[PDB]
């Protein structure tokens, strides 16, 4: 600290023990990331095998009832619970664990511990980048998945009626969440979601293109027919011919990369930007502020009985979702709908 | 031993083995 005496205290001993090379590094974030993450994965795994969801959702989402990996899920609490943190010691469970389960408390446990585990994992990336003395572009990239986690598992149920409308920790419940936004929100039509789709598809495109181009322009670097044995970290020369790659993609696609930095920063930028745009769109849907309908098209459809497009068809299929799916997805709302008022056309 | 690697691999090993033994019991349960 600037050639000072720096008298050693318990802090320096603890820092010296935490910043050590082991099989798995601990650091300061190990005070948070390790317990929070281990509790999150253990809570999800325990809820997916034993903790039932019969009380809250009126369904089975655990292995102990007859569900598979693609069926079991740590389910959210009931909508009447609102937005309670739902502690095991709170007014809900009153200190009782065996009924803290089957009431959605384990969902809140997993969600809070996962959020703090993600916080600790970015702190992990930051402090390890400090130890290796490298820029934390990994943390810069990781800022987007946690933005998605917050906007999806926290902001959306916080803005809507309660945790019941949040995604439950599972597979088929996530699929229900997806179809829920499809029918109730028309999330495909939201421009921010279109940006998120473009970002992920472009990121996978960059992944495949970069890997294929580097692996097909990787020089000889030896005599053996296996290219992987020709790589050596001791030499400082570049493994692949960037000028050859640039010429190839310039003559195929028309545009090509000239800078490794700009290439890798693009690979960094596209998924982060797409995921932040999707996070902003889900923040918009957290307040039920939808890109659901087009005013000109709905007016033209109302005043023209023979003008129809795929948007009108999509609206109708959304009504199919709502009418035939909310009746069972929302047991708290008590939809005892007769099945002659549901929209159901010819034969099917 | 009881080192950091030992603690981590045991915290991942022991409950996963318990859960696998549990689920192998769960497979033969019938209504």
């Amino acid at each position: 600290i600037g050639t000072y005496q720096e008298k050693r205290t318990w802090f320096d001993d603890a820092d010296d023990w935490l910043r050590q090379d082991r099989f798995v590094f601990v650091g300061w974030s190990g005070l948070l990331l390790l317990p929070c993450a281990y509790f999150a994965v253990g809570g999800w795994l325990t809820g997916c095998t034993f903790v039932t969801s019969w009380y809250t959702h009126g369904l089975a989402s655990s292995y102990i009832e007859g569900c598979n990996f693609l069926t079991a899920a740590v389910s959210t609490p009931a909508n009447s619970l609102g937005h309670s943190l739902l502690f095991v010691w709170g007014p809900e469970a009153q200190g009782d664990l065996t009924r803290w389960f089957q009431l959605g408390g384990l969902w809140a446990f997993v969600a809070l511990h996962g959020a703090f585990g993600l916080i600790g994992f970015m702190l992990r990336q930051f402090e390890i980048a400090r130890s290796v003395n490298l820029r934390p572009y990994n943390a810069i990239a990781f800022s987007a998945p946690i933005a998605v986690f917050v906007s999806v598992f926290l902001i959306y149920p916080l803005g809507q009626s309660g945790w019941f409308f949040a995604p439950s920790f599972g597979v088929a419940s996530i699929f229900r969440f997806i179809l829920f936004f499809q029918g109730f929100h028309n999330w495909t039509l939201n421009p921010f979601h279109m940006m998120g789709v473009a970002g992920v598809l472009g990121a996978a495109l960059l992944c495949a293109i970069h890997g294929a181009t580097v692996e097909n322009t990787l020089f000889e670097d030896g005599d053996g027919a296996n290219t992987f044995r020709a790589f050596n970290p001791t030499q400082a020369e570049e493994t692949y011919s960037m000028v050859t790659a640039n010429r190839f993609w310039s003559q195929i696609f028309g545009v090509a990369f000239s800078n490794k930095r700009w290439l890798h920063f693009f690979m960094l930028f596209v998924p982060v930007t797409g995921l932040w745009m999707s996070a902003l769109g889900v923040v918009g849907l957290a307040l039920n502020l939808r890109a659901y309908d087009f005013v000109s098209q709905e007016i033209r459809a109302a005043e023209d009985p023979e003008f129809e497009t795929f948007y009108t068809k999509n609206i109708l299929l959304n009504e199919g979702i709502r009418a035939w799916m909310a009746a069972q997805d929302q047991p708290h709302e008590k939809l005892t709908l007769p099945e002659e008022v549901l929209p159901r056309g010819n034969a099917l | 031993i009881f080192t950091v690697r030992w603690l981590a691999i045991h915290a991942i090993a022991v409950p996963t083995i318990f859960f696998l033994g549990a689920i192998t019991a769960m497979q033969f349960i019938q209504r």
Binding site: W17, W89, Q94 | -
Partner: peptide, 30 residues
């Protein structure tokens, strides 16, 4: 008066205190 929810919160504060003490002892050990 002291409602049961507040009493439970105070025991929760004590529980978090002993959990932090336990993780501090665990990291100062080994």
């Amino acid at each position: 008066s002291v409602t049961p929810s507040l009493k439970n919160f105070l025991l929760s504060l004590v529980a978090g205190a002993v959990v932090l003490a336990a993780i501090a002892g665990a990291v100062t050990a080994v």
